[PDB]
Design a protein around this motif. Structure first.
Motif, PDB file in Angstrom:
ATOM      1  N   UNK A 115       0.791  -1.214   0.000  1.00 40.35           N
ATOM      2  CA  UNK A 115       0.000   0.000   0.000  1.00 40.35           C
ATOM      3  C   UNK A 115       0.826   1.268   0.000  1.00 40.35           C
ATOM      4  N   UNK A 116       0.157   2.409  -0.169  1.00 38.96           N
ATOM      5  CA  UNK A 116       0.857   3.685  -0.183  1.00 38.96           C
ATOM      6  C   UNK A 116       1.268   4.054   1.236  1.00 38.96           C
ATOM      7  N   UNK A 117       2.499   4.539   1.376  1.00 41.87           N
ATOM      8  CA  UNK A 117       3.027   5.031   2.644  1.00 41.87           C
ATOM      9  C   UNK A 117       3.713   6.354   2.340  1.00 41.87           C
ATOM     10  N   UNK A 118       3.079   7.460   2.722  1.00 48.27           N
ATOM     11  CA  UNK A 118       3.552   8.781   2.342  1.00 48.27           C
ATOM     12  C   UNK A 118       4.019   9.578   3.552  1.00 48.27           C
ATOM     13  N   UNK A 119       4.855  10.567   3.257  1.00 44.91           N
ATOM     14  CA  UNK A 119       5.534  11.401   4.238  1.00 44.91           C
ATOM     15  C   UNK A 119       5.637  12.801   3.657  1.00 44.91           C
ATOM     16  N   UNK A 120       5.828  13.781   4.535  1.00 43.31           N
ATOM     17  CA  UNK A 120       6.096  15.150   4.124  1.00 43.31           C
ATOM     18  C   UNK A 120       7.419  15.575   4.744  1.00 43.31           C
ATOM     19  N   UNK A 121       8.236  16.266   3.954  1.00 36.07           N
ATOM     20  CA  UNK A 121       9.562  16.665   4.398  1.00 36.07           C
ATOM     21  C   UNK A 121       9.464  17.857   5.341  1.00 36.07           C
ATOM     22  N   UNK A 122      10.210  17.793   6.442  1.00 39.12           N
ATOM     23  CA  UNK A 122      10.248  18.870   7.424  1.00 39.12           C
ATOM     24  C   UNK A 122      11.387  19.845   7.170  1.00 39.12           C
ATOM     25  N   UNK A 163       6.436  12.654  -0.205  1.00 43.35           N
ATOM     26  CA  UNK A 163       7.321  11.552  -0.549  1.00 43.35           C
ATOM     27  C   UNK A 163       6.635  10.249  -0.167  1.00 43.35           C
ATOM     28  N   UNK A 164       6.813   9.216  -0.988  1.00 47.66           N
ATOM     29  CA  UNK A 164       6.277   7.897  -0.681  1.00 47.66           C
ATOM     30  C   UNK A 164       7.406   6.882  -0.745  1.00 47.66           C
ATOM     31  N   UNK A 165       7.351   5.893   0.129  1.00 46.41           N
ATOM     32  CA  UNK A 165       8.379   4.867   0.134  1.00 46.41           C
ATOM     33  C   UNK A 165       7.921   3.710  -0.744  1.00 46.41           C
ATOM     34  N   UNK A 166       8.891   2.946  -1.237  1.00 49.11           N
ATOM     35  CA  UNK A 166       8.624   1.875  -2.187  1.00 49.11           C
ATOM     36  C   UNK A 166       8.810   0.501  -1.556  1.00 49.11           C
ATOM     37  N   UNK A 167       9.109   0.448  -0.249  1.00 49.18           N
ATOM     38  CA  UNK A 167       9.039  -0.759   0.578  1.00 49.18           C
ATOM     39  C   UNK A 167       8.487  -0.389   1.960  1.00 49.18           C
ATOM     40  N   UNK A 168       9.034  -0.962   3.030  1.00 44.60           N
ATOM     41  CA  UNK A 168       8.523  -0.709   4.375  1.00 44.60           C
ATOM     42  C   UNK A 168       9.257   0.458   5.045  1.00 44.60           C
ATOM     43  N   UNK A 169       8.721   0.910   6.181  1.00 45.39           N
ATOM     44  CA  UNK A 169       9.331   1.996   6.942  1.00 45.39           C
ATOM     45  C   UNK A 169      10.315   1.501   7.998  1.00 45.39           C
ATOM     46  N   UNK A 170      10.719   0.234   7.942  1.00 46.97           N
ATOM     47  CA  UNK A 170      11.772  -0.242   8.827  1.00 46.97           C
ATOM     48  C   UNK A 170      13.054   0.550   8.591  1.00 46.97           C
ATOM     49  N   UNK A 171      13.859   0.674   9.637  1.00 50.18           N
ATOM     50  CA  UNK A 171      15.164   1.282   9.482  1.00 50.18           C
ATOM     51  C   UNK A 171      15.119   2.796   9.347  1.00 50.18           C
ATOM     52  N   UNK A 172      16.292   3.352   9.042  1.00 47.09           N
ATOM     53  CA  UNK A 172      16.497   4.793   9.058  1.00 47.09           C
ATOM     54  C   UNK A 172      16.645   5.409   7.674  1.00 47.09           C
ATOM     55  N   UNK A 204       6.398  12.657  -4.916  1.00 45.69           N
ATOM     56  CA  UNK A 204       5.211  13.053  -5.664  1.00 45.69           C
ATOM     57  C   UNK A 204       5.341  14.470  -6.212  1.00 45.69           C
ATOM     58  N   UNK A 205       6.189  15.293  -5.587  1.00 46.86           N
ATOM     59  CA  UNK A 205       6.358  16.684  -5.988  1.00 46.86           C
ATOM     60  C   UNK A 205       7.261  16.805  -7.210  1.00 46.86           C
ATOM     61  N   UNK A 206       8.428  16.166  -7.175  1.00 38.78           N
ATOM     62  CA  UNK A 206       9.444  16.352  -8.204  1.00 38.78           C
ATOM     63  C   UNK A 206       9.528  15.206  -9.198  1.00 38.78           C
ATOM     64  N   UNK A 207       9.024  14.025  -8.844  1.00 36.16           N
ATOM     65  CA  UNK A 207       9.146  12.861  -9.692  1.00 36.16           C
ATOM     66  C   UNK A 207      10.435  12.087  -9.542  1.00 36.16           C
ATOM     67  N   UNK A 208      11.380  12.569  -8.738  1.00 31.69           N
ATOM     68  CA  UNK A 208      12.661  11.904  -8.590  1.00 31.69           C
ATOM     69  C   UNK A 208      12.598  10.869  -7.466  1.00 31.69           C
ATOM     70  N   UNK A 209      13.603   9.991  -7.435  1.00 35.95           N
ATOM     71  CA  UNK A 209      13.623   8.898  -6.471  1.00 35.95           C
ATOM     72  C   UNK A 209      15.010   8.759  -5.866  1.00 35.95           C
TER      73      UNK A 209
END
Length: 60
Positions: free
Chosen positions: A1-8, A27-36, A43-48
């Motif tokens: 599923x989608x997991x999104x974040x906003x940069x601070x 920003x959305x992650x392409x796996x899990x939120x484990x780790x750092x 979603x803003x710039x299209x880059x990864x």
């Protein structure tokens, strides 16, 4: 599923695989939120690339 974040804070790329982003980007992650460090897509710039978890917060 989608997991999104906003940069601070602005983050500038310093490696071959991380992702520059500005405060406020969605920003959305392409796996899990484990780790750092997460492989992410802006979603803003299209880059990864890897982003640090301590620069972002969850965004629905």
């Amino acid at each position: 599923g989608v997991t999104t974040f906003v940069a601070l804070y602005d983050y500038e790329s310093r490696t071959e695989t991380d992702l520059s982003f500005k405060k406020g980007e969605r920003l959305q992650i392409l796996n899990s939120s484990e780790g750092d460090w997460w492989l992410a897509h802006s979603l803003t710039t299209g880059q990864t690339g890897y982003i640090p978890s301590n620069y972002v917060a969850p965004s629905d």
